[PDB]
Write an enzyme that holds these catalytic residues in place. Sequence first.
Site, PDB file in Angstrom:
ATOM      1  N   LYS A 102      -6.137  18.145  -6.343  1.00 18.16           N
ATOM      2  CA  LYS A 102      -6.167  17.471  -7.632  1.00 18.16           C
ATOM      3  C   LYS A 102      -5.043  18.006  -8.504  1.00 18.16           C
ATOM      4  O   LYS A 102      -4.637  19.163  -8.378  1.00 18.16           O
ATOM      5  CB  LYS A 102      -7.511  17.662  -8.340  1.00 18.16           C
ATOM      6  CG  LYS A 102      -7.889  16.516  -9.251  1.00 18.16           C
ATOM      7  CD  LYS A 102      -8.426  15.351  -8.450  1.00 18.16           C
ATOM      8  CE  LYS A 102      -8.427  14.082  -9.266  1.00 18.16           C
ATOM      9  NZ  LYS A 102      -9.180  12.993  -8.588  1.00 18.16           N
ATOM     10  N   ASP A 142      -4.387   8.251 -10.642  1.00 18.14           N
ATOM     11  CA  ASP A 142      -5.659   8.541 -11.290  1.00 18.14           C
ATOM     12  C   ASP A 142      -5.653   8.013 -12.719  1.00 18.14           C
ATOM     13  O   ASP A 142      -4.855   7.130 -13.046  1.00 18.14           O
ATOM     14  CB  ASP A 142      -5.965  10.036 -11.263  1.00 18.14           C
ATOM     15  CG  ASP A 142      -7.446  10.318 -11.141  1.00 18.14           C
ATOM     16  OD1 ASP A 142      -8.244   9.372 -11.284  1.00 18.14           O
ATOM     17  OD2 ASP A 142      -7.815  11.482 -10.895  1.00 18.14           O
TER      18      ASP A 142
END
Length: 416
Positions: A102, A142
């Site tokens: 991430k 994202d």
Amino acid sequence: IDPFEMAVKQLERAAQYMDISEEALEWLKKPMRIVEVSVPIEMDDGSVKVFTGFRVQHNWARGPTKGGIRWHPAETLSTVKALATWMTWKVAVVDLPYGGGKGGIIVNPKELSEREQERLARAYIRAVYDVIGPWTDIPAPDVYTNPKIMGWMMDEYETIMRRKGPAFGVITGKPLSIGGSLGRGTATAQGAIFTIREAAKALGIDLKGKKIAVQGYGNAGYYTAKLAKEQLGMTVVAVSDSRGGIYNPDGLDPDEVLKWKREHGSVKDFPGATNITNEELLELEVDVLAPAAIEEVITEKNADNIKAKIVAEVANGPVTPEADDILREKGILQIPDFLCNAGGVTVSYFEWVQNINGYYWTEEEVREKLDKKMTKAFWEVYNTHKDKNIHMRDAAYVVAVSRVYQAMKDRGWVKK
Ligand SMILES: NC(=O)C1=CN([C@@H]2O[C@H](COP(=O)(O)OP(=O)(O)OC[C@H]3O[C@@H](n4cnc5c(N)ncnc54)[C@H](OP(=O)(O)O)[C@@H]3O)[C@@H](O)[C@H]2O)C=CC1
């Protein structure tokens, strides 16, 4: 509630339902590598501003880590770590050769111009180049990040990498012109449809002629309704947006509803449909319920009053643990959130394979491979659910953690 604390608690809960050593649990409670870097860019007024960027690689026992990059003013290292931990299980449940990763930059992108956003993407790549790669870490779109930024990041990575390998495969979600993939628009809905079909197969229910209600009519909700009606032959009787919802027992046409939403700004007041509230949609007697909207729409208050046979958690955690227990007690099959919407991660992996191989497939090939992947994952989760007599979500967590655990044991990282 701290996000990383929540993730660790979830992991411990999952470990409580399976045989895992203490050393493996301690290893899994901590990200294997966290990189925090300064991201300096030149503003349009000529000034220089420094932003905080993150890149957390939770675990890479199963392969290169996979995860998106978030551009939010409220980004925190704890949130990035928790999302990387969740991405690990996300890729493990659907059997991908990936780890968990991430990224994030603490920035408000609404106040940045196109040139400033491009500079931000290129500077982030320049900062985190040493810990990313086609076989090390593959970023993805994202929140507040799109394929445009993916193309900029890929171009910067290729420039730094001197074209010494598959620079297309360093990042996914790219435009079709540069290493992109087909079926990326409807990945989540397609995976949800495959999981719903498999759930109906497991329950012995023929979906042809049944009813489905979808909460949230964005990209995921609209495509879920559309694909259900097209492939599964299920009558769409209710859809909703933020403003409200509509109901019609005779059926809805998703294209017309989308047209009306894109014309009236909302799905409300659709001709021939009765206006209902979101709460009222959760009350309808249907056979498939697909919450594709805000998190925590099913709580302990309304868990009992749910009449759906299958609840497809298309969104990210629309059911609370108390609601989970209540719904399980009512003999209702739940499809876990990070298994139902596994199409996204599954599609990203296909894009990476296409980039690595240098050969792109068609829409049909992607659709069939996704079908196989989702069927296998759901079947692997449902079998755990039936054998261990635990909750559906718990079965998926057990499968993912078992997969990661076995990979760790095979490498010799943990001896027990
Ligand atoms: N779509 C994807 O590619 C993937 C999706 N997810 C998860 O899926 C869900 C939806 O994805 P996505 O299509 O991108 O979302 P979108 O931003 O495209 O659309 C959001 C939809 O949900 C509605 N909505 C937002 N807040 C509420 C609310 N409080 N109550 C009722 N409806 C609400 C929006 O209404 P309105 O149109 O009026 O604003 C809209 O219909 C999210 O939970 C997300 O986390 C993650 C994996 C990838």
